[PDB]
Amino acid sequence: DRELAILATAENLLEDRPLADISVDDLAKGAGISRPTFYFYFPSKEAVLLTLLDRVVNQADMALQTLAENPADTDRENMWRTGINVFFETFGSHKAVTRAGQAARATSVEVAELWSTFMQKWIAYTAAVIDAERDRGAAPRTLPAHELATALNLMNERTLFASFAGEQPSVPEARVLDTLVHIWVTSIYGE
Amino acid sequence: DRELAILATAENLLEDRPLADISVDDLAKGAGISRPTFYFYFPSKEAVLLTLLDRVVNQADMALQTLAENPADTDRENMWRTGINVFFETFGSHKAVTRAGQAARATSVEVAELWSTFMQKWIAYTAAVIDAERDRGAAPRTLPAHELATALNLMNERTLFASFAGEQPSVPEARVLDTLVHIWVTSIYGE
Numbered sequence: 001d002r003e004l005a006i007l008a009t010a011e012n013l014l015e016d017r018p019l020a021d022i023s024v025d026d027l028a029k030g031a032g033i034s035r036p037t038f039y040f041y042f043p044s045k046e047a048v049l050l051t052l053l054d055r056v057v058n059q060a061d062m063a064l065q066t067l068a069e070n071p072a073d074t075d076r077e078n079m080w081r082t083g084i085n086v087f088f089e090t091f092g093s094h095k096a097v098t099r100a101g102q103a104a105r106a107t108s109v110e111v112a113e114l115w116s117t118f119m120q121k122w123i124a125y126t127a128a129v130i131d132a133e134r135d136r137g138a139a140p141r142t143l144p145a146h147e148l149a150t151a152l153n154l155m156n157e158r159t160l161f162a163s164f165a166g167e168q169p170s171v172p173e174a175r176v177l178d179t180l181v182h183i184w185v186t187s188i189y190g191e
Numbered sequence: 192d193r194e195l196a197i198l199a200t201a202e203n204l205l206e207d208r209p210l211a212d213i214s215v216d217d218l219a220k221g222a223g224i225s226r227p228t229f230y231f232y233f234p235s236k237e238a239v240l241l242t243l244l245d246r247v248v249n250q251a252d253m254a255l256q257t258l259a260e261n262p263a264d265t266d267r268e269n270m271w272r273t274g275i276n277v278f279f280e281t282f283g284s285h286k287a288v289t290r291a292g293q294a295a296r297a298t299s300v301e302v303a304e305l306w307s308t309f310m311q312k313w314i315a316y317t318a319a320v321i322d323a324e325r326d327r328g329a330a331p332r333t334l335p336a337h338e339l340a341t342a343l344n345l346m347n348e349r350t351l352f353a354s355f356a357g358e359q360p361s362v363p364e365a366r367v368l369d370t371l372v373h374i375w376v377t378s379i380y381g382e
């Protein structure tokens with residue numbers, strides 16, 4: 001729609017500057033519409049970022065749901081690698097939205113609640129798979145599954161974001177998947 | 192000095208509200224001085240937070256240096272637990288400064304560089320101990336030591352902060368030390 005044009009303009013402009021340096025008039029100009037026509041589709045530039053983040057987070061969530069219903073036929077290391085890779089590829093494909101979404105989180109209760117809702121879902125699913133692994137006798141009963149899942153998911157949130165944002169310090173982007181898979185597998189399967 | 196009174200006032204006021212909701216006049220009033228006398232000791236409320244964070248970070252750093260020179264006589268699990276506990280106790284004792292310091296980081300190049308400098312030091316020290324553990328034949332040569340160290344330190348930064356800030360999701364504060372020690376020990380010693 002013109003809606004898609006506003007979203008595409010915002011994702012494109014977030015690649016060279018922060019949301020603070022983008023005006024409603026910048027987004028309108030980019031989408032070939034007026035300022036008031038803009039305000040028809042979205043109440044604020046903040047609402048545009050929220051919609052962009054919602055789309056990225058639901059893409060990750062739907063990719064993980066697809067994988068959950070369609071297990072890869074490989075060893076347990078390559079199965080965790082496949083699941084972590086959903087997040088690596090999805091957020092890694094939308095770095096500017098990921099970086100601006102993380103920033104907004106301090107300032108936007110809707111952005112903070114969106115990230116919180118999905119992190120709770122992804123942790124609950126992580127804990128359920130660890131529990132299944134313990135029930136089949138492949139993983140030892142060590143930490144409570146939900147607490148282990150929480151820290152592994154927060155590790156991935158922080159470590160993926162540092163790599164994508166080029167922070168110092170960070171794991172290089174070409175090494176981060178293998179780094180996370182090692183810590184997940186040793187911490188889930190180790191005595 | 193009056194310097195200490197300004198710092199004590201700022202740490203006390205950060206326990207009930209963010210830096211954005213504190214005025215230079217609030218800090219002056221709390222320290223029993225005028226606004227211009229305030230500006231003698233610090234150029235901005237931002238500079239007060241930077242000094243508070245600098246003190247907290249250097250307290251952690253000096254506690255870790257003391258431990259490094261004075262190894263506990265216990266198994267390797269309790270030794271990593273002792274080292275992680277420096278961070279748990281130091282930042283956990285200064286939650287309001289930790290929370291405001293993390294926030295400022297998006298907005299303050301000095302705060303971002305301070306955290307970055309110390310994270311690089313703590314990762315370099317973590318990697319050196321893993322390497323020593325591999326050299327003595329107690330730890331297997333798995334991931335590159337520096338990349339493993341990076342992700343474990345970023346895990347701790349994020350997970351400690353979520354617990355302290357009461358985020359959803361978070362590991363409960365009374366379980367976070369044990370959760371982190373499990374992941375460090377299994378990921379450092381596991382094949």
Ligand SMILES: NS(=O)(=O)c1ccc(C#CCNS(=O)(=O)c2ccccc2)cc1
Nearest residue numbers: 079080083084087122126129152153156
């Ligand atoms: N947001 S996050 O990056 O912390 C994260 C969150 C969750 C997951 C996951 C998962 C598990 N699904 S599975 O990999 O298909 C699998 C199936 C069966 C046996 C082993 C594994 C990965 C990452």
Ligand SMILES: NS(=O)(=O)c1ccc(C#CCNS(=O)(=O)c2ccccc2)cc1
Nearest residue numbers: 270271274275278313317320343344347
């Ligand atoms: N900022 S952070 O929380 O990620 C972190 C960073 C670094 C450390 C540490 C450490 C290692 N020193 S040691 O524990 O004394 C030890 C000595 C000998 C044998 C095993 C261990 C802990 C935590």
